[PDB]
């Protein structure tokens, strides 16, 4: 994409590896010149940072844009969605493309590429949830990973009779998805026992969002992690768990590391902003705003926990799972928990939510918030160092980041078309100022300047190095000596 | 039962709890009187010990005498089986009960009680494996704990499409045993990787014994003792692990007691005496004869750790696990390593392995040792302290110890039809000299003074106090308050 | 002593091992008879319990009556006291002989002789501190320990220019400690670092309460128990950690107790009841109350963890530490936190304390109750089976326990001369009835039947056996060899 | 430094962060350009890769060339010390400047430059030995830092009456460099209680290099580690701890930095390449050829936990502790182990024994390999992007690296005027074919073609970000209200 010459003068630019002091020039969506007193042409915008730090745009890994459910959608779509990612510092998205049990995986890849390229403010990839197994969907998932361009693939774990998979159907899976050089994700909770928790939490009569919360323990997420992590091993198979909310998991994906597994965790917003006491609030439609899996810890020593972990390295990565609906949505699950639909908001508060919890409180540095807002997501889905990196040669996606900036966050101010925002009345520390997105300014003064459907699909290629060089070096020495050995 | 008027004179007696010099005397089956210089009826047989230590009978959680497999038997049977427990100073037996899948439970109950009755030198009792799971079968485990004596139900997670079991079905069988007040027993691995691990093992040429160890890594171990503990959390109910043999399964016990879980653990003499490298022996038959689920691990330090935990409490009592077959019927996976039956070796060297390896080496006392060889064991089978204790109206099973004694294990000498010892020529600090069991003497100057059909069948009541106090506390604490909440 | 003849009808007994109905025959100090329907002499006092239940009575191993402080005296005596613990189920205490530096040990123990033999209501053992170290007092702890029947010793890590010994006085004081068969016993806490953090809390102003818990972290309590540990480790000495008040020591405990050290935890009723947000409080009064070393942890979930781990074993018995001083001796502290006395009270609701807190948690059933009331601290300093246990021959000091009882803690109502109660208004579930001590009836109907100076000293012999046999064991196996070498 | 044009076409560049094919032209000491297919002058020298790896030159962060003994030197000085280094891979080295106890730190740093610019191969800076302690030599770390590019010094805990410093004195020493912005880098070993068990080992007649490893077990290598931990947590200090030796002192680094406190771990050669069961040879010169402190650990499953440890990220960078003594030095301490000088190999073989170790065993990969090899060195001590990158801008320092490579280690071949090498006959994977440092090739063909004197001072400034942001983060947290309280 052709987009004006833009210069911005005297800023901190800060990447995951180091800071320095330097003028950035960008032309036609890329950065051509980074340096001290630059040859600039005339006839030129300029953006003056005053010292203010320089980012790139963050990307956010699990979004639900206009997610289908139940011939429904939710209420914040790839275009009004990107809006608010933007709005809150981020430029990139990766969307679950979710085909329905016994449909064309590649179908619902069509569906979604059509939605998202005609909609999409900024740019964008998709992982696709792999929802069901068979010969046939096997044989998609190679064509989607080779003419597609996407490297990610999910499993659900939970939703008994739904999408659930056997350990039978996740080791063919994960033995699939290794051969073939792609990220399994799960979405890590135990199907079979919370389907029994639900039917005992109704019988106890407990109707209401925290008949969610008590439904699912995070015991049972702990154990489908642990699975997981083990099945994983054992096909050596990279894995990817989505949607981190309790201290147990994140203490499973760090132990797995710590022996030397592939395993990666993504927190969300929700996680690191607020715990789940909300979810026994008098006021029914904000606490069945809260409603989603897995749901908060109502542990609230768990927002700083999580916070710690992203920042030790024992995390990675941020992503939102933004999956917004309205309260007259969320209503239909009035008298049952069980058919509130599930999801949150964060898209939009992601980056200044970790800057406040994270960077202000002394646990992560600048650069490590880089780092888990755009560039280990970029290393992990083989985007870097086209995106998550401020050098010649990459992408102008890119913000100017106050730290002294203090914003309260309401739903009266986000983007969202819900009318509850989980982490209503927060003062946060940390904002961005501008937002520059394919080279174009997008956010100034508060004010967007996006344009619907600009974003283009960012195909990611499988074999990522960053996961997949370990896991080769592994796959050449499973050559397991039988004994030599005489008959009886 | 009548039997002779015995006094011991001049012992160091030793429980779990204390050890005291005293005389014992006993009569009709019971001790009657301890202490110092006792007033004794002339005409009775009197034991000199010289300071030698008196212990409780050991007993044996775990055992498979004649157990039927493929229209075939175990080569030790209730008889041969309990005269080699007791050259070993062990003077019960818990023998596991193995209905056929789609059999009754009851009908097996009735096939194993004829054949120990008739045979055992010892008392005895026995478990109940449900092997398989349906409205008819809950049924029958009413009836067992309520009729016949039975408090202890044993599930399988490995073997698929055989023994194995959803989580759906560990829910339901967890729940119902909570409430009926029985021991919660696992068979934990994961039969679903397992599995597929055979078939890689095989597709990769492996077809001898090491082929059955590399199927089956710890690791699937690990994840059906975590499944397992989580599923018998959520349902409040104590959790037994069945034959320990991992490092890391040890340490997810070790991990849940800590928290609070009712969960106990069971190593066996294979793990506690000696690891797994000779799986890979040149000599197929020696390394057919290690072939037992789960496997003795490769990882040597094994052994040493699993008598460290042992120690500690994070383990509470020893089994055997006691299972032998011919080199003849293991011979039938000669070519295939699935196809090999499945166990070893251990209830006569099960407490001097324990005082050899844990004892002797500083890491557990005599008391201790007692504990962890019969009194933890009775206590949590509902025996104590008819069992495991040396105190007035308890039984009198008990042994003269002497820990100065050192003898060396070989197939030559053991009272066992197995042509093979896993742990053949090992010299073993620690034996017992006496053996009196029933008030009987059944072992003196190195010479077996058996009866066929001796033992009798001992009753376990459920709801034992140790078990299930903690748990009768928690049953009710789990009123859930709903939330007041005005309609929408 | 001789005494009247009791017998108690109708109750439920419980020991640390076993819960039986029983009733229970005493006389003289001791307990003669126990079964159901006894032969039993007419004019005999009798005492219904209706099933209640019938428990050992308490060991309160940390007490500090009377103690000197700056030519002063702790405002609870040895008889005050000891009607405090007796009223709180409490029948015997170990007190803290503090010798002055530079003072003899012996005379320090002939003076507290003095005090206790006089004054106590009930039996009572006695801990002597080790508050200083050259070859004299070394010759005095061997004197204690042979002709004195003191068989524990307690080192300083705090109190810097005061009470503190460096790591080569722990050194050879664990090895003495160690060689004579005594338990060493730490206050640890690092003293260099909170000294300088003290006068920094102070430089920021920071002269309340609150600079005390501020200025003693339990990172520095963790470090002094680690350090312990291991110089205990090098020395096979047992190490015996008093006061433990902190998640972080408790678990390097729990960590050196699963390697296999000899190692006990001390947690009192302070940490097991209450946390330290009481440092805060607008009321100066109040905070000073709290006033301890190691201090309450203001990380609220401190006790509920500290009764998790007690429950578990990780934790082994319960103290209090009593050492109450008036609010006009906190007071001279006024301006200076650092010249505030140290000590809180407890003695009194110790097991009530943990009744409620880990009892009715459902964390501990009663059996585990009574080890960690009274039965291990019994075992530890050798006072087993004499005291701990309602078996025949024992001691006749035993309560009867209500666990439907419900008390609100006041200090109008406490039996301390303490102005404050840092558990005030606390409502506690389960509660004694009736307080057997001696023999005699010394509480019934909320009223106590004391009397001043009926205590016996019990002297305490070395080389316990629940300690001192791995000890052994490992004390001869430490014959090292050296490589047989030619020379060079 | 001016020197030759030098091209080098067809390589895959790898650095920490991404690998990618590229040439690469190098002039005046400096990466002018990276691309494909370059504009290059002619008359310029070209080197071919074949695709084989380029990468950034090593980083050794800890040397002891030509270091001060008892009026002697170590037999490999800052020449062939640098030619060892270069022949194995490494082209800068950080050395430890050693100033006597009551000596100046100034003088000593003189002292140090002097034979470093003199005889050095390669670039090169220095850390500075804090061997006592007063405001004297205060005010000379001051100095240090401010004027003589130094950012690095290092305090003992062992040594006792040597170098020894109390815990006041680590106080207050972490309280100054952490202000001035220093790395506080700590020699971890209890001295008070290895002195005694020195003494201990020499009682028992052991007075071979066995008598070494034997008085300091890693129990206090531990020990110290935590003990500097927790104070340099008090002081907001950021830790360095030097010559990682166990897997205890690796465990409590990595539980440290989870938690979020600034502490890095340097593993060396020794402890990444082989364990100490040569302190056994029966060759008592081999044996006395490991002695190092802390030693290498008999533990032998030691070394691979360690490199897990290195690739997980609980540990950052490598060093060698290259500290080499000839047989007749180390022959001082025939009958004596505590007189043997203490030091081992390790700066050539540093790079290809992690290859071997990490690389080729699956547990990281290349860019890992870099991160620890040079980069995070390079980033602590605030060398980066200057030092361990090949990026345009950087120093010309890097090595064609060929990981199909495989040589066999021995003190024949090595550069060591040691007359034995620690890793004697291992076949190591990997190793450099060319090695270019200052542009220069100074290894080609197995050809070493270095400069004396050639090496440049690299001077490194204080508050390096990757260390200080979150030190600087905190300092400006540390406000601690005190209680608005009216008097009493």
């Not at 800060?14 to 003028?23: L, T």
């Not at 209420?75 to 064309?104: N, R, W, Y």
């Not at 409180?361 to 985007?383: H, P, R, W, Y």
């Given at each position: ?334 008298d049952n928990f069980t058919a509130i639909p599930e999801g949150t908001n964060g898209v939009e508060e992601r980056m200044s939510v970790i800057w406040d919890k994270a960077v202000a409180t002394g646990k992560m540095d600048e650069n ?121």
């Amino acid at each position: 994409i052709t987009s004006d010459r833009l210069l911005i003068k005297g800023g901190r630019i800060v990447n995951d590896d180091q800071s320095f002091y330097a003028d950035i020039y960008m032309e036609d969506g890329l950065i051509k010149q980074i340096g001290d007193n630059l040859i600039v042409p005339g006839g030129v915008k300029t953006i003056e940072a005053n010292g203010k730090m320089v980012i790139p745009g963050g990307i956010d890994v699990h979004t639900h844009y206009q997610m289908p459910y139940k011939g429904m959608t939710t209420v914040d779509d790839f275009f009004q969605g990107t809006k608010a990612a933007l709005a809150g510092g981020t430029t990139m998205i990766i969307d679950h493309v979710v085909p329905e049990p016994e449909s064309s995986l590649t179908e619902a890849y069509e569906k979604w590429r059509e939605w998202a390229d005609g909609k999409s403010c900024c740019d964008y990839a998709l992982h696709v949830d792999i929802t069901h197994w068979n010969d046939s969907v096997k044989q998609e998932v190679q064509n989607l990973i080779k003419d597609k361009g996407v490297n990610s693939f999910m499993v659900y774990m939970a939703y008994k009779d739904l999408y659930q998979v056997s350990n039978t159907e996740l080791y063919e899976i994960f033995t699939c998805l290794g051969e073939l050089g792609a990220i399994a994700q799960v979405h890590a909770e135990n199907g079979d026992i919370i389907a029994q928790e639900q039917t005992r939490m109704l019988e106890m009569g407990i109707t209401g969002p925290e008949g969610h919360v008590l439904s699912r323990p995070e015991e049972l997420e702990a154990e489908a992690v642990f699975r997981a992590i083990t099945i994983a091993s054992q096909t050596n198979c990279p894995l990817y768990v989505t949607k981190v909310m309790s201290k147990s998991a994140a203490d499973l994906i760090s132990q797995a590391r710590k022996k030397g597994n592939v395993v990666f965790g993504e927190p969300i917003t929700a996680s690191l902003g607020i715990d789940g006491t909300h979810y026994w609030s008098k006021n029914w439609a904000k606490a069945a705003a809260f409603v989603t899996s897995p749901p908060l810890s109502p542990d609230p020593t768990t927002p700083d926990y999580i916070n710690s972990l992203l920042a030790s390295g024992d995390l990675q990565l941020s992503g939102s799972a933004h999956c917004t609906f309205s309260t007259a949505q969320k209503a239909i699950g009035k008298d049952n928990f069980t058919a509130i639909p599930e999801g949150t908001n964060g898209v939009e508060e992601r980056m200044s939510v970790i800057w406040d919890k994270a960077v202000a409180t002394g646990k992560m540095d600048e650069n490590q918030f880089v780092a888990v807002t755009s560039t280990n997501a970029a290393k992990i889905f083989n985007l870097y160092p086209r995106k998550g990196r401020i050098s010649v040669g990459s992408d102008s996606d890119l913000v100017i980041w106050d730290p002294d900036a203090v914003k309260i966050v309401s739903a009266k101010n986000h983007q969202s078309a819900a009318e509850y925002n989980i982490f209503e009345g927060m003062e946060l520390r940390g904002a961005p100022l501008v937002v520059i997105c394919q080279g174009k300014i997008m956010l100034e003064d508060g004010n967007l300047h996006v344009t619907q459907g600009a974003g283009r699909f960012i195909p990611c290629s499988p074999f990522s190095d960053y996961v997949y060089k370990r896991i080769k070096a592994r796959r050449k020495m499973a050559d397991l000596h039988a004994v030599p050995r005489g008959m009886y």
